[PDB]
């Protein structure tokens, strides 16, 4: 009666085998799901307020090293001299600074002026750039209320207002300067629910932070996540300190592996990016900027001292990042080095990529950096690299660098296949995916590396042009409404279809009290209306 | 040519079943393994050092 044994098992478990193989694929994706980028925001000296502005600036080889600001109450004359040994003096007086640090919109988030002035500029600027990045992702910030998304950030303390204190703004300084309050406040104002974490690994603090987010996004405690870092300095005490060891470049320009590599240069930086799982982002219809394949973080540990890193740790972290990403040195073709410009770290990094990349290369890999274009931005500097590569990968063009006289002699460039990317080059699609490497070596000892892959191929879709269409805009203030209207007018001066931009502004924006609507059927019609629109009603409902 | 096919199939099959079942429990252990504690140290006011 048990003769039913021959045919049965095959049909019985033809599904069991594929089920259990699918489970294996599930473990593979769980440990190694590529993560997706959908949001973007950056703020850098030289007037950089949008990522495309930065990309264009790098494209035109424009330096951004500025002069030391004086609005912070600095006794500049007491710090500038040719005496590098004089107490409390810096042999450098030129450096990139974000001059818009003091500017802020307190009313947008409903912030009283007393706490606003008492509040650390880092936090307000965090909130602004976070909102900008979230909008850039085309996601309604209001809809994020009650969601499980989390926030991760990286920043070190700076003691803004740590000196003389007035007896009026008391009660806000502790919340003003505490680092965790940054993420706490951004989540509170956004009404989120995911984990809120602030970290610190010196200049690498951004790069590690987003890496952490990846784990969370892989683990499943949040749908999307926010990452990035900001560094703005209120006291020049760093420069003079480094001026005591003469680590800075007297001209304030970091020569990335150049012949004249003789110092470093500091700058302020702002960067925020939205991270999301590839499958979830694909389902949600959000556009894909670029995909991460893996990450690695490790501490150098023992070394010749405390500040000097060991190249073997760099080799280990590069290999670990490549293995976790499942990539090989052949596939990648461009790596964003740290580009500190120090006479010590630069040769070590150079031979590190020599030993880890300059092998069995059928094509000579290209090396570039951004610090020759702007400088070092401390914690933000790391994430700054991610800002430009994704733009460079977007435009299919390799951006050049600056101050390239000839490569520093401390590197046997014959050993590897690397060469410095001193000239802008085309980086087009060819059917083979394009990959870019990012790295950061914090002075605290920890080092991090990131791997980026180009976004997949998405077919363009053609749509009919509607005869007539409304254009709507909402904001919290009338002047903000006018500025927005002028901005869409300026954008409309370019070549865009009216229907698509109308759909975008109606589907990728929130709704605010200040409202304005203009009906138009032609680009000229809408431009004229926007530049002439002056009647707006912030009414109350009945 | 294919008379005793199921006879070979059973042994072609059981090992695969148990192997990928071990993979199935591997996923659970990977995303759910308890973490042991091996050492603690503490310093608290009142002279507490251990």
């Amino acid at each position: 009666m048990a003769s039913t044994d021959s045919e049965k098992v095959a049909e019985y478990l033809r599904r069991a085998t594929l089920d259990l193989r699918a489970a294996r694929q599930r473990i593979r994706e769980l440990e190694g799901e590529p993560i997706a980028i959908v949001g973007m925001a950056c703020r850098l000296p030289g007037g950089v307020a949008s990522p495309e502005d930065l990309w264009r600036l790098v494209a035109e080889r424009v330096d951004a090293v500025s002069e030391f600001p004086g609005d912070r109450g600095w006794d500049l004359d007491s710090l500038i001299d040719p005496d590098r040994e004089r107490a409390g003096t810096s042999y450098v007086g030129q450096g990139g600074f974000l001059h818009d640090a003091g500017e802020f919109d307190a009313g947008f988030f409903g912030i009283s002026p007393r706490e606003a002035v008492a509040m650390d500029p880092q936090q307000r600027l965090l909130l602004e750039t976070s909102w900008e990045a979230l909008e850039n992702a085309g996601v309604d910030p209001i809809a994020l209320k009650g969601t499980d998304t989390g926030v991760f950030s990286g920043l070190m303390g700076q003691g803004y207002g740590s000196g003389a204190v007035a007896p009026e703004l008391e009660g806000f300084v502790t919340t003003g300067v505490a680092s965790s309050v940054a993420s706490g406040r951004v989540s509170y104002v956004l009404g989120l629910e995911g984990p809120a974490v602030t970290v610190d690994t010196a200049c690498s603090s951004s790069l590690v932070a987003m890496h952490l987010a990846a784990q969370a996004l892989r683990q499943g405690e949040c749908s999307m996540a926010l990452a990035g870092g900001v560094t703005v300095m209120a006291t020049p005490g760093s420069f003079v300190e480094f001026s005591r060891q003469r680590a800075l470049a007297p001209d304030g320009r970091c020569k990335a592996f150049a012949a004249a590599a003789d110092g470093t240069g500091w700058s302020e930086g702002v960067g925020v990016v939205v991270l999301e799982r590839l499958s979830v982002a694909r389902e949600r219809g959000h556009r894909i900027l670029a995909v991460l394949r893996g990450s690695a973080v490790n501490q150098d540990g023992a070394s010749n001292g405390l500040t000097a890193p060991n190249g073997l740790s760099q080799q280990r972290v590069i290999r670990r990042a490549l293995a976790a990403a499942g990539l090989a040195p052949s596939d990648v073709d461009v790596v964003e080095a740290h580009g500190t410009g120090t006479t010590l770290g630069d040769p070590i990094e150079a031979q590190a990529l020599l030993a880890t990349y300059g092998q069995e290369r059928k094509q000579p890999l290209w090396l570039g950096s951004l610090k020759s274009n702007i400088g070092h931005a401390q914690a933000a500097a790391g994430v700054a690299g991610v800002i430009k590569m994704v733009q460079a990968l977007r435009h299919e063009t390799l951006p050049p660098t600056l101050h390239v006289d000839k490569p520093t002699l401390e590197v046997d460039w014959s050993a590897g296949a690397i060469e410095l990317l001193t000239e802008a080059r085309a980086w087009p699609r060819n059917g083979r995916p394009r990959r870019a490497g990012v790295s950061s070596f914090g002075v605290s000892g920890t080092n991090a590396h990131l791997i980026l892959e180009e976004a997949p191929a998405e077919e363009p879709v053609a749509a009919p042009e509607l005869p007539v269409v409304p254009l709507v805009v909402s904001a919290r203030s009338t002047e903000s409404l006018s500025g927005q209207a002028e901005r869409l007018a300026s954008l409309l001066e370019g070549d865009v279809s009216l229907t698509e931009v109308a759909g975008a502004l109606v589907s990728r924006r929130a709704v605010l009290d200040e409202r304005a609507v203009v009906v138009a059927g032609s680009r000229e019609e809408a431009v004229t209306g926007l530049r002439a629109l002056n009647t707006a009603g912030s009414g109350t409902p009945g | 040519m294919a008379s005793t096919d199921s006879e070979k199939v059973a042994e072609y099959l059981r090992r695969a079943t148990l192997d990928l079942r071990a993979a199935r429990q591997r996923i659970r252990e990977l995303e759910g393994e308890p973490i042991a504690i091996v050492g603690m140290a503490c310093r608290l006011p009142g002279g507490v050092a251990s």
Partner: antibody
Amino acid sequence: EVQLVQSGGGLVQPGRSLRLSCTASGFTFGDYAMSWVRQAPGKGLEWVGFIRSKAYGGTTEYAASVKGRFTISRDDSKSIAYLQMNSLKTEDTAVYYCTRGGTLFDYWGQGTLVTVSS
Amino acid sequence: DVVMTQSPLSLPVTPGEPASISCRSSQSLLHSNGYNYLDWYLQKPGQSPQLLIYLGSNRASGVPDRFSGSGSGTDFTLKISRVEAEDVGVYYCMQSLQTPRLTFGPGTKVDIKR
């Protein structure tokens, strides 16, 4: 976990007979079907034979080159696979492995080198 | 009627580079039930043979994820995603449709590239 130990090898002279035992543990010994393979020094590996499970009658199968001289047997009570070699020649000097699975050679033992020389 | 198998004899590979070994056959191995009766065995020097891939597109435990198999009919390919120092050895591609199998064939020798 699953393991098995091979034993009973060593130097032997041509002509006589020997037996090789293999203790398998960590699984249902009687359900599976065991097999024996040989590997000559500096050559390929040759499938000696196998024994079916008691579900299929516990039949035996031997390579025709070594058939009639070697006999495999099972002790499911003690979970031991035995291979009795007889009338040994110098050509039989090789290593021998016992493996669970008649067709799939899932798990393999540590091996046992048997050398026949005058 | 017995189906023979063949492959490139030796393929030195630089470490950390994706490698592929192609196994051909004189006839299709796919059965009516819808399965290819093939497998791959590894053999480290001074080490017992080990099983990696069975019925073409399935990997056993212990074998790292980097290994994978593909192909059907008469052709098959074992792709090792990334090669470390302990992948040097001998690889055998065996069929399973016709039984018994006398030998594992010449195999393929995998060493370091220099």
